[PDB]
Amino acid sequence: SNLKIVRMDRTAGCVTGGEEIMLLCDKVQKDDIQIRFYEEGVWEGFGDFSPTDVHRQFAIMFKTPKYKDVNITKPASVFVQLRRKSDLETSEPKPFLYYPE
């Protein structure tokens, strides 16, 4: 084994294909892997991508905190950044939009 599809941010698509998808998987080689789609006499098709599209990284599945004002009637735009606990270093912030329920 060793090859496993940990995750796919999209499990459906238009028969026309050509839509981008982010697939997460365990250890693989960038130039020795391929995503094959098949249907059991035997149809197949492969995903379009290149060696520069495949990078090793960290993944954090977390749950969002609750904004301060629960009762807004309009989207509140704020920031989300990474922060290291030991030296409180940070990352470039990123925009995140909260909406009323």
- Segment 50 to 89, residues that bind a copy of itself, using CB under 8 A: 53-72, 76, 78-86, 89
Q: Binding to a copy of itself by residue 42, rule CB under 8 A?
A: no
Residue type, 85: K
Positions 20 through 39 that interact with a copy of itself (CB under 8 A): 20-29, 32-39
Distance CA 92, CA 32 (A): 33
Tokens of 61: 């599945």
Distance CA 28, CA 56 (A): 9
Rounded to a whole number of angstroms, the minimum distance from the CB of residue 59 to a copy of itself is 6
Rounded to a whole number of angstroms, the minimum distance from the CB of residue 26 to a copy of itself is 6
Cβ atoms of residues 67 and 79 within 8 Å: no
Q: Binding to a copy of itself by residue 16, rule CB under 8 A?
A: yes
